[PDB]
Symmetry: D2
Subunit: 291 residues, 4 copies
């Protein structure tokens, strides 16, 4: 069918490639060079978001921020500069929950359907179609795009109306960040107390301390494996979205605010491009004691 | 063998009752009145402490705080002034890791083995024999008491040498607290953002936000079911061990520090006696938005 | 000389009025309606921006945020596309320190001097000509505009080169926030402890706790007098500059981070429009104890 | 007159010496050696607190903690082991506000008057009689001891009834600690922003950022002068008193809790014996940037 993809970064490119290899028809547009492998599968690289839209019935979007999603939709040569009657816009960018509601609304007033469906899983998840997809929007629309979500991901969930997808993603990033920080506090304390991080993590696995973070990341902190799986610089962007929403909704998120500052400490000490599990280096530095 | 129990009450009592129910002969003692059940089960309520240590090779201690464990060990009517040669003393209280280090070697230089095996599971855990037990000590000693631990709980884990048992428990309590607070910040936010907590929780269940806390405690927050399972006042006393240990070992535990303060807000608003899942109320108060 | 004002409103207006009242001829502009007072005082409300820059050697900018200062500088109807040679541009807005660094050198390579001179004192300060002014730039340039600053405020201070003016303002706002929060934690505590805040405040006045904040704001908290002097919503926008700057420069500002969250609790409970001394209410809420 | 002094540490010794050089009669007792200069002035070193009390009408006490004050008053050979009818006990130790109320009460029931009057100013303040004295108790009693407070200090204040003195001291230590941390955040940010710490501190002096901490300590942070004036290890003790009271009174003191953790970071990095102005090294470490 006629699908369009705007934004082909480390996530967008492989996602589009996945839809193209599934036999779907695609016109794409990105700030820069398109992947040979993508055009190699039928994809047609056009010049603007407006043209992707004039062609497709379902438009996918993968841009860095709320402003890009904003520009792509209503910019000078964007998706709205052409009729959107009967179309479906699927933003899979991680952007403001509040701005999303507004966007989805004005695209509705132009006769189009809106689906906000931010993802999690990183570039590996995107290459292998195992992305986690939290979706905001109406069921019927969700059902309609689902076959496509299936190619792109594994865990797909309709969380509610427009905006809940972005919102669900913010909540996931808050917990992931707070969970990583807790394991860091608990293990660095255990280590400086004289206990063996390996054992404690094992002991704590059976019980209420158990979580996927303690399982995967706790391991990385011990083994010192910090190769990018999700760069700290990226999680800082995610928490920044969290805090700004908190400010707009008047929410007091004491530990999300601190985690952001803890990440600032990682940056200042060469951790911006390491895996967010390296968050542990912050507490080690602060206690002067590595695992 | 022939055992001894030096602390009854909320948890020591049902624990003694389980050991007595397995055929063991126990010489118990405590400040309060020995429950009839264990009296009429073989336990001999020898009027005081030094005595339990006499007719018993393995002595179980289940007292409230670090200082009371020290007096039981080296007090006038204590285990001191009595031969300790060829005996095994096992403290199952949750006390100071650094302290345990020295209580142990003190007892060790008196001719006895020491196992610090703090426990978690609460009242219901002690009665049911399903307590989680983290142990610090020498393997053979652990192996010797093992059959008894088997009667007292399911998850028994030898964490390392003397002190690592306590260190393991503290680490457990830090993560349970930080994880509970994390789910609270994410859901209160998701809620005030307009999303349905049941939904978000459902989504985050399949990814990296997944935890034993979001599953159980998450639910407790949504259905507003806070009947005790583990009192906030209790988790308060525990976080105090972590913070005092942290202070002694010079560790910067920022979110644990904050969590203790948030618990202060709960106690300030009638949450001291509720399940620590009641934590969520602190953030609801700070955001003026419940659920 | 011949001056220009590019931003009126809450503060820009009374500032322009003070310059006009001193005999200077001002070519002003802003989105809203120019107050009659300055119109009937010499100010020529030249319909737009590029024009103010033409008939004026020193241009004053008093716009809300960093981006609006950038558009005034390099926008279509902006100071750009107009010779800037031999001119002096002075931004008195409180914007981003890092941004100002580049706006400055941009203007500098166009043939003009730049002074970033953020101000503090609020509405009443601007009307009364008693604003505090921190300035970043070259001394001779500062010396040139100095006579005008003298009309606008009392405390004028050349802090350093371009950008240090903004950096100085942010530093001011961090301490005012942290000091206000400190007095709040100490007095709420002293109060709930049974002591009289008037007393404690009186004592701490003669020692190291002494501050310009405990003196003024301390009083405001006791007599419950929170009528605006400086809105929390305003100090919120400011703490956001500090936190965004902190994030860019990779600084861990833990208490500033928390203060911003506590302000979120105030906004959540109708304090957005009150004097930032209203901060105390956040801790009163968190302790369930007022005064 | 007949005065007694219990505790002759770095504070107590010079304080007692000051009362002895004023021509007063003194019997003292300390854990250890008494100063030659003190006995040199008439002071009689007795063996126990009970004997100091049997002799004096007004008993001064300078011990490290709530437990010592406790023991000195009701211990096996303390002040209460002798009649206290008509006497006046003056505790100048910094201890729990809550425990104090209880102490003062039971000494009242034994016919004696109680005055809690913790001090601030350190050992220099004690040698030179410039100590700051915050007093809890009844006026008439305060008036009666005042002549003595005059020899010992400079700033003396009756803050209210028994306990308010300790309480007033806790509040002073919270503010001092929070104020020091704020200057540290503001200056380290300013420095990494490129501004000159010297100028900013000067700029900020005129305005609401002004406080004694910014004046004295801000200077020490720039000049790097960290020679003990008040050891961080000591301020950690003071904040520890704060937090435990917070726990007992159910108070949420978010920035006091963090400051304690920030100090833990100083300890772990050799700052336990430096002046609490060295608190700034924590943030520098955390941002990887010294002033």
């Amino acid at each position: 069918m006629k699908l369009g993809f705007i934004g082909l970064g480390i996530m967008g490119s492989p996602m589009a490639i996945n839809l193209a290899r599934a036999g779907h028809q695609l016109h794409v547009t990105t700030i820069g060079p398109v992947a040979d492998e993508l055009l190699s599968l039928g994809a047609v690289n056009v010049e603007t978001a407006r043209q992707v839209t004039e062609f497709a019935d379902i438009i996918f979007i993968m841009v860095p921020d709320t402003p890009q999603v904003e520009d792509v939709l209503f910019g000078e040569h964007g998706c709205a500069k052409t009729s959107l009657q009967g179309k479906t816009i699927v933003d899979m960018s991680s952007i403001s929950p509040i701005e999303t509601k507004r966007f989805a609304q004005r695209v509705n007033e132009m006769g189009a359907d809106y689906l906000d469906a931010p993802v999690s899983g990183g570039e590996i998840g995107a290459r292998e179609g195992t992305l986690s997809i939290m979706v905001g929007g109406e069921q019927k629309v969700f059902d309609r795009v689902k076959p496509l979500f299936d190619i792109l991901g594994k865990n797909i969930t309709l969380v509610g109306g427009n905006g809940d997808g972005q919102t669900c993603k913010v909540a996931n990033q808050i917990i992931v960040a707070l969970n990583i920080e807790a394991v860091s506090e608990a293990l660095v304390f255990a280590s400086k107390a004289g206990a063996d991080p390996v054992r404690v993590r094992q002991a704590l696995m059976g019980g209420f301390a158990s979580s996927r973070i303690l399982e995967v990341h706790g391991e990385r902190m011990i083994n010192r494996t910090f190769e990018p799986g999700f760069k700290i610089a990226l999680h800082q962007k995610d928490l920044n979205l969290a805090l700004q929403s908190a400010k707009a909704l008047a929410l007091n998120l004491p530990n999300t605010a601190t985690c952001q500052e803890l990440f600032n400490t990682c940056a200042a000490n060469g951790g911006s491009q390491l895996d967010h599990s390296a968050m542990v280096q912050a507490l080690e530095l602060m206690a002067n004691h590595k695992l």
